[PDB]
């Protein structure tokens, strides 16, 4: 009624400031300063449009994106969509689980194993907020997102960034490879597929309506909510870029990508509090997006398949890759890479059904996405798919 879809929007935004974005934005600032801010902005406004379509999809149609895929498309393709999404929600949760567990290690020093054990029970409880209703989880991530922003505003004011150099960083341009490659990373690996499905689910039948006029009133309300929540995610990501830029650019800081070193190098540069507020930000970022990713996986199979496995069981499965990595002891290289391959793999599968169904009257009724805007969504999906193919190309090889 007032802000009906902020919750759904905030649950969707947290995936766009997950630990994955922390490492990317940190390395972005550390290596090339502010010269990539325009990429974070452009990437965020693109996702802002995407998540707005998924939200509108659930509002107008009263069915989440996996639901419409289940009833409209053959079950061979649906079963693959369930498996595809499950791997995407699982690969995504991995970088969020490990990032959360890493944050605990930075705060207490416990081995990554127990840090992951802490991440499990806590991330589990965050989904018993989901068993009954959903508002409680929406405040949970809301309060978490709130502690991600204040953590990086106070870091920005500490990093003392050169607004002239921050503004110059918003001019679309780059200088050679690496900078260009990392920009392609931000464009390609920003849209989170698992949240494209979930967002429509948190909006379906959220406000019971029985007309076509009352629905479009929700579409206009939801639009402000998505832009507000997604816009927030951008500024935060821009903050993570500027802080790293305002601290590591010309400081001989190498290997700044991984967070276990940025946390360390922050103490002698900014201060010990800059490191703590960075670790808690990472912690809150990992717990939330992991819990959201777990709820995403729940509505994913519920919508694609119908049947529903216990959340604790689902929590346990997605929790195994993390411990496998910890008990193994590999570098984020093979981890951060292999996982983002699956996300880049699942981006197209999330946007193609979204742009199509949102352009059908048998799904949307009189709330079909304006043709002029359906186009803008496809050109957005094309370059993201294109740049996902390039990334996917560059790692796999060819």
Author numbering: 39 to 436
Provide excerpts from the study.
Natural resistance-associated macrophage proteins (Nramps) are APC-superfamily transition metal transporters that enable uptake of rare micronutrients such as Mn2+ in plants and bacteria and Fe2+ in animals. Nramps bind and/or transport biologically-essential divalent metals such as Mn2+, Fe2+, Co2+, Ni2+, Cu2+, Zn2+—and toxic metals like Cd2+, Pb2+, and Hg2+—but not the abundant alkaline earth metals Mg2+ and Ca2+. Nramps have 11 or 12 TMs, the first ten forming a LeuT fold, as seen in structures of three bacterial Nramp homologs, including our model system Deinococcus radiodurans (Dra)Nramp.
Importantly, a tryptophan modeled in the inward-open DraNramp Patch mutant structure at position 223 clashes with the top of TM10. The G223W ΔN34 apo dataset compiled from many small crystals is 96% complete to 4.5 Å, 92% complete to 3.4 Å, 77% complete to 3.0 Å, 66% complete to 2.85 Å, and 52% complete to 2.7 Å. Compared to the inward-open and inward-occluded structures, in the outward-open state TM1b, TM6a, and the top of TM10 are splayed open, and loop 1–2 is displaced by ~4 Å, to form a wide aqueous pathway to the metal-binding site. As the transporter reaches the outward-open state seen in EcoNramp and our apo G223W structure, a protonation event at D56 may prime the binding site to receive another incoming metal ion.
